[PDB]
Structure formats: structure tokens, C-alpha cells
Amino acid sequence: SLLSLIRKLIT
């Protein structure tokens, strides 16, 4: 869930 969106703002 949260790791599916915020992942693009970190890698």
C-alpha cells in the first residue's frame, strides 16, 4: 500500500 506510491519520491 504506502510503499507503492512514496517509492517514486525516494528512487
Swiss-Prot record:
<comment type="function">
    <text>Linear cationic alpha-helical peptide that acts as antimicrobial peptide. Has antibacterial activity against the Gram-positive bacteria S.aureus CCT 6538 (MIC=40 uM), S.saprophyticus (MIC=40 um), B.subtilis CCT 2471 (MIC=40 uM), and B.thuringiensis (MIC=40 uM), and against the Gram-negative bacteria E.coli ATCC 25922 (MIC=80), E.coli CCT 1371 (MIC=160), K.pneumonia ATCC 13883 (MIC=80), and A.faecalis ATCC 8750 (MIC=40). Has antifungal activity against C.albicans (MIC=40 uM). At high concentrations exhibits activity in stimulating degranulation from rat peritoneal mast cells.</text>
</comment>
<dbReference type="GO" id="GO:0050832">
    <property type="term" value="P:defense response to fungus"/>
</dbReference>
<protein>
    <recommendedName>
        <fullName>Decoralin</fullName>
    </recommendedName>
</protein>
<keyword id="KW-0204">Cytolysis</keyword>
<dbReference type="GO" id="GO:0042832">
    <property type="term" value="P:defense response to protozoan"/>
</dbReference>
<keyword id="KW-0044">Antibiotic</keyword>
<keyword id="KW-0472">Membrane</keyword>
<keyword id="KW-0964">Secreted</keyword>
<keyword id="KW-0295">Fungicide</keyword>
<dbReference type="GO" id="GO:0050830">
    <property type="term" value="P:defense response to Gram-positive bacterium"/>
</dbReference>
<dbReference type="GO" id="GO:0031640">
    <property type="term" value="P:killing of cells of another organism"/>
</dbReference>
<dbReference type="GO" id="GO:0050829">
    <property type="term" value="P:defense response to Gram-negative bacterium"/>
</dbReference>
<dbReference type="GO" id="GO:0044218">
    <property type="term" value="C:other organism cell membrane"/>
</dbReference>
<keyword id="KW-1052">Target cell membrane</keyword>
<keyword id="KW-0929">Antimicrobial</keyword>
<dbReference type="GO" id="GO:0043306">
    <property type="term" value="P:positive regulation of mast cell degranulation"/>
</dbReference>
<keyword id="KW-1053">Target membrane</keyword>
<dbReference type="GO" id="GO:0005576">
    <property type="term" value="C:extracellular region"/>
</dbReference>
<dbReference type="GO" id="GO:0016020">
    <property type="term" value="C:membrane"/>
</dbReference>
<keyword id="KW-0467">Mast cell degranulation</keyword>
